[PDB]
Amino acid sequence: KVREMELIYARAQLELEVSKAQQLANVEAKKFKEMTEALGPGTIRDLAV
């Protein structure tokens, strides 16, 4: 029974964990996408060339 409850904590906490990492990955990637959409191709072009 302790193994069972342990499976409950495991599945729940793992799901919340993956959801957190996913949502943070979302805000991060959306942030970087906002950056490249903002400063534009030519700015990173300036940094590169």
Binding site: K1, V2, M5, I8
Partner: protein, 49 residues
């Protein structure tokens, strides 16, 4: 022969008696211990849940 076998038989049967009372007593005490651990881990599993 009868003397030494008699005393050795007495001490040996004494050990057998102690082993038997220890036996059944271990059985019952292990059983009550089983119910105790059962109810304790049950309520514990509940509140922890």
């Amino acid at each position: 022969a009868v003397e030494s076998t008699g005393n050795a038989k007495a001490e040996a049967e004494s050990r057998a008696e102690a082993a038997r009372i220890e036996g059944e007593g271990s059985v019952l005490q292990a059983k009550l211990k089983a119910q105790a651990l059962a109810i304790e881990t049950e309520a514990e599993l509940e509140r922890v849940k």
